[PDB]
Amino acid sequence: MKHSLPDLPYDYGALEPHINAQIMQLHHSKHHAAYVNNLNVTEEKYQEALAKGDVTAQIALQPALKFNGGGHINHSIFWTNLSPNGGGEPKGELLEAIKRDFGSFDKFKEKLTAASVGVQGSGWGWLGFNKERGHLQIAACPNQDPLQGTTGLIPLLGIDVWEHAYYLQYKNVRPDYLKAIWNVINWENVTERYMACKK
Amino acid sequence: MKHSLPDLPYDYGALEPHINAQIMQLHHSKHHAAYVNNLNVTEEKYQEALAKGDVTAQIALQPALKFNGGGHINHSIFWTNLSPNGGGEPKGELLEAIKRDFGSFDKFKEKLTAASVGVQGSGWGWLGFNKERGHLQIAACPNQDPLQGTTGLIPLLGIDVWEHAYYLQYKNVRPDYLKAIWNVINWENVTERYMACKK
Amino acid sequence: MKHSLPDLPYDYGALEPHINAQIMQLHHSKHHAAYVNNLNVTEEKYQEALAKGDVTAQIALQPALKFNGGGHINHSIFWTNLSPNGGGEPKGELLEAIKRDFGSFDKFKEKLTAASVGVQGSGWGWLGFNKERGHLQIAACPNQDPLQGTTGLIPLLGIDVWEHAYYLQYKNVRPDYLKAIWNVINWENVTERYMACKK
Amino acid sequence: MKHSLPDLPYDYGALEPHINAQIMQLHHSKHHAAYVNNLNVTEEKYQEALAKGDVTAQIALQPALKFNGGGHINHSIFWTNLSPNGGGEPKGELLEAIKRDFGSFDKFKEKLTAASVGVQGSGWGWLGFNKERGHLQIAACPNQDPLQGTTGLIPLLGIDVWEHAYYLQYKNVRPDYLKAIWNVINWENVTERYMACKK
Ligand SMILES: [Mn+3]
Ligand SMILES: [Mn+3]
Ligand SMILES: [Mn+3]
Ligand SMILES: [Mn+3]
């Protein structure tokens, strides 16, 4: 079982004018493609190392596995979090959980925006689900470090704040990108990840 | 004594076609300007905190100080490392030190290139001077973490590999940026930092 | 400011047989004492660096300030968290907050124990208060990194799991130390810190 | 592979009075033993994760693999670095390499001592070999992070400065432990590791 680059559920230009086709094409077809290939390359090296019990080689490979493995996980989620039919507000139990845990939908937007803009360097802003406490929680992750593997939280909604995610369009003004991305959020997908946690 | 944004020693377009004016203008007039202002803001908060002995406030501010303080230091060095009259190879004692410590000028280029391309996320590649051992040394730093404050090495030549340093021109192909930047290296300035370490 | 080593609120042997007098004496009069002395030394150097605008020197000092500064913060709270009159269970609003957020007092005990035993290397287990969410939260911190300065949580109860906190008595068996320490928790102080977080 | 706890090359009390038998026995039969058992447990979980392509699970396991894996690597070298027949100074090519790279044996001793005493929290001091530059190098590592896996340096001589390595005998006075340990260094083994690095 090899990992593969998933096809995008929409055309590269489907999110215009909020995210233009050139960013989407570069972000998906160059960046994500590289993470999955290097993940596959890295897993073969680690697979060899684990069989020989070469702990030094296993440990030397951990950054490459985390970096490329996280990149694959994160972008694969990210594409599903966006939709040309998205935007607006969530409904039903997710909306009620957000009001419950954050006060209002607007306060949640403020807190996730603040977490994303506050990332020093490259990283991600997340809405996550805390299985232990049974409530929603906002977290930020550096580089391509994935949410669940490093915090235990189930990822619901991720915001890529790597400069390659917005720079061609918004240059250094990260707040403009965060403002625009709310217009294409696929709350149906966010809701489906959330409902899968509860039973 | 307040920190200030230094003027560039050349026109925004002086490094064309290797680095185009739009990157230089954005990199200097937006990014660097923000680091120095936030550094000044952060120092006032810390200056208050240190007077009251509020250790919690001092510690809470450390990331902001390191991030914005490093950004100011790094870019201020970076501008001097580039020149429209640069490129080529160094001469004199610096050239001899490089052959001595790295084998050849081309091997040094390979090693600094590899360190820079290998940065996962945002960071810097450096040629530094090890005062303790008295030789040259290559190091990589994450985000805006400055070389001397965190490693003890004296910075000689820095390569900004933040995506805002190349993405508008070279997109995701960081190796193309590293190849081009060798054409505008100010070896005179690199030499002057190096000679200041020796006595 | 010139920080000072606080006097202990009890005799070094007051917690026997749960924590023996030699640990308390070494932990207070040698270990804590060293952090205070080095904190004062570190703060003096930092004040000079800030006056000259030496950003490099400020950044070089951050590990010593956080480590020794945190050590002072952490132990000063820790001593107030213990009492020969301690142990048992809390009452009133703190007990109700624990039931709300953790289910029961026993489950809180199990989770804080797990957080403390799970620390890899040197560090601390904490019960803290999250002002943003208005609930209790368990956290672990590495080395002497202090809870509030690095996480924003208000410390209520801290467990030092540096080996110097137990090794003379409990050797490598950290669970025995954790089981014993519940017997000397000053729940009256934990209650006062919690009430101070509320309006 | 199924890693195993290595037999000690000497009696637990063979290094008295420099390192007492109780530390050696606890350090070998409890501390090292725990790393091996948890390493085998951790490797089994990782093999399953790799088979299912569960990248999240692979990443969640990295801290346990590095910590317990490094603990096995580090202590296995450490035991071979000590000998009742040890102490004194090295001879031959190792002694000459030290003079070349550090000036004198005494200065090497001062610097490795400083590197070991300067570790904040748990960790190790190392003399290592840098294959790239072809010279000796002093490094410190946190917790059980292993030298070669995280830095690329070949370990020659390691100093465990976890408190469990000295506290029963030397209490908080790490310099006394460091001064004493020179008396039991197996320079014959250090020499064999160094020669193995050369062609
Ligand atoms: Mn991305
Ligand atoms: Mn830059
Ligand atoms: Mn302590
Ligand atoms: Mn040990």
mmCIF file of C-alpha atoms in Angstrom, chain C residues 53-177:
data_model
loop_
_atom_site.group_PDB
_atom_site.id
_atom_site.type_symbol
_atom_site.label_atom_id
_atom_site.label_comp_id
_atom_site.label_asym_id
_atom_site.label_seq_id
_atom_site.Cartn_x
_atom_site.Cartn_y
_atom_site.Cartn_z
ATOM 1 C CA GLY C 53 20.530 47.628 22.234
ATOM 2 C CA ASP C 54 22.571 44.420 21.944
ATOM 3 C CA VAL C 55 19.864 42.180 20.541
ATOM 4 C CA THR C 56 22.304 39.316 20.074
ATOM 5 C CA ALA C 57 23.147 39.352 23.771
ATOM 6 C CA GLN C 58 19.488 39.498 24.783
ATOM 7 C CA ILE C 59 18.813 36.392 22.684
ATOM 8 C CA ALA C 60 21.849 34.522 23.992
ATOM 9 C CA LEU C 61 20.525 35.000 27.544
ATOM 10 C CA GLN C 62 17.017 33.615 26.939
ATOM 11 C CA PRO C 63 17.773 29.990 27.928
ATOM 12 C CA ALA C 64 19.368 31.014 31.235
ATOM 13 C CA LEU C 65 16.530 33.422 32.070
ATOM 14 C CA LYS C 66 13.800 30.874 31.288
ATOM 15 C CA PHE C 67 15.564 27.978 33.020
ATOM 16 C CA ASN C 68 16.638 29.798 36.189
ATOM 17 C CA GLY C 69 13.686 32.161 36.147
ATOM 18 C CA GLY C 70 11.273 29.283 35.757
ATOM 19 C CA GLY C 71 13.098 27.349 38.451
ATOM 20 C CA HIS C 72 12.432 30.189 40.910
ATOM 21 C CA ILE C 73 8.775 30.497 39.871
ATOM 22 C CA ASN C 74 8.144 26.749 39.905
ATOM 23 C CA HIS C 75 9.718 25.936 43.275
ATOM 24 C CA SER C 76 8.222 28.948 45.031
ATOM 25 C CA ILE C 77 4.754 27.686 44.119
ATOM 26 C CA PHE C 78 5.717 24.085 44.847
ATOM 27 C CA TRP C 79 6.688 24.779 48.463
ATOM 28 C CA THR C 80 3.341 26.461 49.098
ATOM 29 C CA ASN C 81 1.579 23.469 47.547
ATOM 30 C CA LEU C 82 2.815 21.127 50.304
ATOM 31 C CA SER C 83 1.878 21.059 53.968
ATOM 32 C CA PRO C 84 2.194 18.642 56.927
ATOM 33 C CA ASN C 85 -1.527 19.406 57.357
ATOM 34 C CA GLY C 86 -2.238 18.571 53.716
ATOM 35 C CA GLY C 87 -3.650 15.536 51.973
ATOM 36 C CA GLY C 88 -7.192 14.277 51.723
ATOM 37 C CA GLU C 89 -9.528 15.772 49.160
ATOM 38 C CA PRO C 90 -10.513 19.379 48.413
ATOM 39 C CA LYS C 91 -13.936 20.769 49.276
ATOM 40 C CA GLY C 92 -16.151 23.599 48.069
ATOM 41 C CA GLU C 93 -15.899 25.219 44.657
ATOM 42 C CA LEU C 94 -12.564 23.624 43.718
ATOM 43 C CA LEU C 95 -13.949 20.134 44.320
ATOM 44 C CA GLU C 96 -16.953 21.023 42.166
ATOM 45 C CA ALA C 97 -14.744 22.390 39.378
ATOM 46 C CA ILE C 98 -12.770 19.134 39.375
ATOM 47 C CA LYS C 99 -15.910 17.005 39.114
ATOM 48 C CA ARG C 100 -17.191 19.181 36.269
ATOM 49 C CA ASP C 101 -13.959 19.139 34.283
ATOM 50 C CA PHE C 102 -12.510 15.717 35.127
ATOM 51 C CA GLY C 103 -15.497 13.581 36.186
ATOM 52 C CA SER C 104 -14.313 12.780 39.706
ATOM 53 C CA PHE C 105 -11.442 13.476 42.073
ATOM 54 C CA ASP C 106 -10.034 9.992 41.450
ATOM 55 C CA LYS C 107 -9.942 10.469 37.665
ATOM 56 C CA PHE C 108 -8.199 13.841 38.090
ATOM 57 C CA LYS C 109 -5.673 12.038 40.288
ATOM 58 C CA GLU C 110 -5.146 9.342 37.648
ATOM 59 C CA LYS C 111 -4.621 11.879 34.851
ATOM 60 C CA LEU C 112 -2.261 14.194 36.729
ATOM 61 C CA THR C 113 -0.330 11.122 37.848
ATOM 62 C CA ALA C 114 -0.094 9.975 34.233
ATOM 63 C CA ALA C 115 0.984 13.433 33.082
ATOM 64 C CA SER C 116 3.692 13.518 35.744
ATOM 65 C CA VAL C 117 4.937 9.959 35.178
ATOM 66 C CA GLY C 118 4.930 10.474 31.419
ATOM 67 C CA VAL C 119 7.426 13.340 31.496
ATOM 68 C CA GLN C 120 10.504 12.275 29.525
ATOM 69 C CA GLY C 121 13.522 13.611 31.364
ATOM 70 C CA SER C 122 13.296 16.567 33.725
ATOM 71 C CA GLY C 123 10.142 18.600 34.149
ATOM 72 C CA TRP C 124 6.936 19.263 36.063
ATOM 73 C CA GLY C 125 3.342 18.114 36.048
ATOM 74 C CA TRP C 126 0.744 20.846 36.539
ATOM 75 C CA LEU C 127 -2.899 21.344 37.266
ATOM 76 C CA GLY C 128 -3.652 24.726 35.693
ATOM 77 C CA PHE C 129 -6.540 27.073 34.978
ATOM 78 C CA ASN C 130 -7.320 28.155 31.421
ATOM 79 C CA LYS C 131 -8.665 31.698 31.658
ATOM 80 C CA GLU C 132 -9.768 31.726 28.012
ATOM 81 C CA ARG C 133 -11.977 28.609 28.292
ATOM 82 C CA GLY C 134 -12.696 28.995 32.016
ATOM 83 C CA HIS C 135 -11.854 25.421 33.021
ATOM 84 C CA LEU C 136 -9.129 23.333 34.629
ATOM 85 C CA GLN C 137 -6.429 21.736 32.488
ATOM 86 C CA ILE C 138 -3.597 19.294 33.084
ATOM 87 C CA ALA C 139 -0.239 20.115 31.514
ATOM 88 C CA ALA C 140 3.355 18.899 31.657
ATOM 89 C CA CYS C 141 6.354 21.178 31.194
ATOM 90 C CA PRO C 142 9.962 20.297 30.318
ATOM 91 C CA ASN C 143 12.968 21.225 32.444
ATOM 92 C CA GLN C 144 12.109 24.394 34.405
ATOM 93 C CA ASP C 145 9.882 25.935 31.710
ATOM 94 C CA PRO C 146 7.145 27.699 33.690
ATOM 95 C CA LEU C 147 3.475 27.034 33.079
ATOM 96 C CA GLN C 148 2.054 30.545 32.748
ATOM 97 C CA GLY C 149 4.929 32.095 30.809
ATOM 98 C CA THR C 150 4.931 29.353 28.164
ATOM 99 C CA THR C 151 1.284 28.207 28.023
ATOM 100 C CA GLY C 152 -0.844 31.033 29.445
ATOM 101 C CA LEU C 153 -2.382 28.704 32.024
ATOM 102 C CA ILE C 154 -2.544 29.797 35.665
ATOM 103 C CA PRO C 155 -0.702 27.271 37.878
ATOM 104 C CA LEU C 156 -2.751 25.753 40.690
ATOM 105 C CA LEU C 157 -0.798 22.631 41.668
ATOM 106 C CA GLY C 158 2.663 21.576 40.460
ATOM 107 C CA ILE C 159 4.533 18.271 40.690
ATOM 108 C CA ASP C 160 8.344 18.442 40.366
ATOM 109 C CA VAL C 161 9.476 15.237 38.642
ATOM 110 C CA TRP C 162 13.122 16.084 38.391
ATOM 111 C CA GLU C 163 14.988 13.100 39.794
ATOM 112 C CA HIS C 164 16.371 15.305 42.577
ATOM 113 C CA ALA C 165 12.817 15.538 43.899
ATOM 114 C CA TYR C 166 12.584 11.842 44.782
ATOM 115 C CA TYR C 167 15.610 9.743 43.890
ATOM 116 C CA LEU C 168 17.208 9.559 47.331
ATOM 117 C CA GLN C 169 13.955 8.088 48.720
ATOM 118 C CA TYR C 170 12.080 6.396 45.867
ATOM 119 C CA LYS C 171 15.014 5.676 43.504
ATOM 120 C CA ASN C 172 13.762 5.079 39.902
ATOM 121 C CA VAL C 173 10.203 4.314 41.074
ATOM 122 C CA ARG C 174 8.551 7.589 40.146
ATOM 123 C CA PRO C 175 5.050 6.137 40.751
ATOM 124 C CA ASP C 176 5.805 5.645 44.444
ATOM 125 C CA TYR C 177 6.845 9.296 44.773
#
